[PDB]
Write a protein that binds this ligand. Structure first.
Ligand SMILES: O=C([O-])CC(=O)C(=O)O
Lengths: 535, 534
């Protein structure tokens, strides 16, 4: 790649270009002792480099902006146009040029790392993305998280999107421009470019492209899903929707299943496919005994983010002092139990919605009807966990449409429409699984949740006998192998069962009020009957 | 024991009776592979059987009821009497007959375990209790926790109280009967009976008899105390009042002192006596290095409850993901440094109130005046630990009258009256010891607290020079061997003494509001002067 080729993007005076850096090169660069500040890396006992990101320990949804122009005006789900809140705040073309100037100036006159990669496992729908950074570890992050092209694919590489990471710069004019802060994560779908200013959080470099796939794929009838995905020995695929920290990484690395992916998937005529080339796993409280596949992926070429490293070089995975949202990224082949040669398989037969219910009202597991599936997908009731977005310090209940509202570029109903079409063609059954808390105020045990997933995936619940929870009208299995029957009814863990009724009424009303905005069509109005009902 | 004898309690068609089974038989019965559900027992690598009680990981005070009849109407400290918060909820005789029928039908038509035992080490005041269960490990629990009679004592054993464990049954009529849930822990002082319904937590089988002793003993001038107790070489006894998990087990373990007991004691004309035959110890975070004596009691004939047992049979004592209130019970002789063969000694001369102060206000040690002894006994400021009662999941500050409000059948002042009488006759001195937290937000170190107990027990503080903490007016020793003098004043862990005053006045207000219910008598009104003064 030529300096002039990067001059097309507005960068000037490019010194040297480190194109498609190898893992060996990134390792040496990351340990260079001349690095300062948030560029510095340290080597841990496990052989993986660890970095820190300052206060930027989670995403910055309040600094997310999309240029409103002829490409996006009539197609985007805008933060200032709908009944439903979202983070897609409109940006003017003039202000975009100002932000782009800040970033290109910052990346000018410097040695730059350039990573070309794919978002999307399938050539017919993938984005070719060119990432530009001045920091080796940020280049390493995107080499891990996106799909690494072959040499032949590189020779003919034509980028569809450019991502420029200018974490080291900020926008001093932000107040007068009506922006939220001196930081920015900005998208222009006409120039096909993402800018990062101020924030060093690794996730910003992957969830931008997820948002772009969430724009392009549902318009072509392909579902675009915030879920993990795995497959059984017989080719049966399951997808697990949820926010990070609510169980989708942990439940998807099941030893009885083979991993398709961690976080971002599409569903087309052939099946369920991963967008990513790696996994960005939460490491708080990680242990070798509890998560052996993930723990073993932490070795050279993994990249640890905000973990506490002792003076002797060992990692204290239990220490959330910099943040609870500690992370590691690794290329997906650091897990042996994965689908190869491409991260994809056939249609999903099981759809699992993970809800971290902080009210302790919902059952550990419920088998949803078809209408309840749409109702609960649009609702997206769960919790934001500490650190996942800046400013979140404790589990925060939320209605996150499609279990991923922060990444939606289209209206929630457009994701629901495609998901339902694909589920119906497959005969897929959906389940609502509470990975949050119960009446004891304690978190539901991962041992119980894994046993529940086992029972879902082997088909044993599809026709099992059930009872119905009042108010929510959720069908609960009467018994489940490997789990204390008494915990299946969320009422039993209450010292006084009337307290369940009270909290359930409260949560039922939150659901009804949240769902009202989806009832402006006959189809949406008809789903109210599948939601919770007050007496 | 014959079937006819149990049919007198209302049980029908009794098949086999397993009467006072040995420890060896109970081990065989608990490992029967045909057992399902909460009945199942597994063997750990330490040789102790472990059981799991599901969602019943602590006491159920909201399910505790006492029949209100001619025996109890005028004497019990009822929950609806308007004289302070308590769990003594009244039950009608009619609803009692319904609950009893649920349990007796549940126990009918099957093999029963019967354990006869004593509550109280002295024959003159002890209850003879007969426990009936359909689960071997529940019989094991009571074999551990109550006093195991000799063959001669079983010969003419005559029950004073019957405890029926019907954990496997529930009450479907609970809503219309005005009860809290389908579970129940119910007491009838006229029939002299306890019923257990629905809940499998072992401690329900011991704290019910504690509540009965707390009724019967103070009415005849015998103190009934939620405390641990031990005795030195000279015969001097100490009692440590407090809630479980706030130091009474740990601090009574002391090479200079033989253990009398862990949790429940009486104090009569002859001295201090354990009610129990064993210990029900909290095991969260237990380690051999930190609690060697308790750890070494976990072996065959102990009974682990809700501890995590791995697939290889090892125990993960640190895992609180199900509950922090993991427990083990063992007969007391699993501790070597004990008073034997009877768990009793003379009069106490040192009385230690343990307060787990979550606000970092109170001194690690204060020497109380006579009026302060009553004021702080009645206030019972401390904290309830996670899991000890259902629904508690973090340290919870509480005013637990007499350091055991959950078990008081009479008004708090009746326990204070008898305690003061015994202390005064014995020349006893009281100390208030903070086992909780200091200004920094960290917990007071056990090493400091152990040095404090040493200094109390050898009499070195009784005449030592003191200074006075303001507001609470607490006499603090000016120095103390084995602790850095810095720690004795609770202000020193605050940036400024004004920052302490801030916290202190907040807590003092809670003390004053909590004590006001005691001020309708001249004596109670006079005690306000011994409390904190804003
Ligand atoms: O998945 C979410 O909800 C957030 C996240 O991981 C990311 O930041 O990359």
């Amino acid at each position: 790649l030529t300096p002039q080729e990067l001059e097309a993007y507005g960068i000037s005076d490019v010194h040297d270009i480190v194109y498609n850096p190898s893992y060996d090169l990134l390792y040496q660069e990351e340990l260079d002792p001349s690095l300062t500040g948030y560029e510095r890396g340290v080597l841990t006992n496990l052989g993986a480099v660890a970095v820190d990101t300052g206060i930027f320990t989670g995403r910055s949804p309040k600094d997310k902006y999309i240029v409103r122009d002829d490409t996006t005006r009539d197609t985007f789900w805008w933060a200032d146009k709908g009944k439903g809140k979202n983070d897609n705040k409109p940006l003017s073309p003039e202000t975009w040029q100002h932000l782009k100037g800040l970033v290109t100036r910052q990346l000018s006159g410097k040695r730059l790392f350039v990573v070309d990669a794919f978002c999307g496992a399938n050539p017919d729908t993938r984005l070719s993305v060119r990432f530009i950074t001045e920091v080796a570890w940020q280049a390493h992050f995107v080499k891990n998280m996106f799909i690494r092209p072959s040499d032949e694919e590189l020779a003919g590489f034509k980028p569809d999107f450019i991502v420029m990471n200018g974490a080291k710069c900020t926008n001093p004019q932000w107040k007068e421009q009506g922006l939220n802060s001196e930081n920015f994560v900005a998208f222009n779908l006409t120039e096909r470019m993402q800018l990062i200013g101020g924030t060093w959080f690794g996730g910003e470099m992957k969830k931008g492209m997820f948002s772009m796939m969430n724009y392009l794929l549902p318009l072509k009838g392909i579902a675009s899903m915030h879920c993990s995905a795995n497959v059984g020995e017989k080719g049966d695929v399951a997808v697990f929707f949820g926010l990070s920290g609510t169980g989708k990484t942990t439940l998807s690395t099941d030893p009885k299943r083979r991993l398709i992916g961690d976080d971002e998937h599409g569903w087309d005529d052939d099946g369920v496919f991963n967008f990513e080339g790696g996994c960005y796993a939460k490491t708080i409280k990680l242990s070798k005994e509890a998560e052996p596949e993930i723990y073993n992926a932490i070795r050279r070429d993994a990249l640890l983010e905000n973990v506490t490293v002792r003076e002797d070089g060992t990692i204290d995975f239990d220490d959330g002092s910099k943040t609870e949202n500690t992370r590691v990224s690794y290329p997906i082949y650091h897990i042996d139990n994965i689908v190869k040669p491409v991260s994809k398989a056939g249609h999903a037969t099981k759809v699992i919605f993970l809800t971290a219910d902080a009210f302790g009202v919902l059952p550990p597991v419920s088998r949803l009807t078809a209408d309840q599936t749409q109702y609960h997908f649009l609702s997206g009731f769960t919790a934001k966990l500490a650190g996942t977005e800046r400013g979140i310090t404790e589990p925060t209940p939320t209605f996150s449409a499609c279990f991923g509202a922060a990444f939606l570029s289209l209206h929630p109903t457009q994701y629901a429409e495609v998901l339902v079409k694909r589920m119906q063609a497959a005969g897929a059954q959906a389940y609502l699984v509470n990975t949050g808390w119960n009446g004891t105020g304690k978190r539901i045990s991962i041992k119980d949740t894994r046993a529940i997933i086992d029972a879902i995936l082997n088909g044993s619940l599809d026709n099992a006998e059930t009872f119905t929870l009042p108010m929510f009208n959720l069908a609960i299995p009467t018994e489940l192998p490997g789990v204390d029957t008494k915990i299946l009814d969320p009422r039993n863990t209450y010292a006084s069962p009337e307290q369940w009724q009270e909290k359930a009424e409260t949560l039922a009303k939150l659901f009804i009020d949240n769902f009202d905005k989806y009832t402006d069509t006959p189809a949406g109005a008809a789903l109210v009957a599948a939601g919770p009902k007050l007496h």
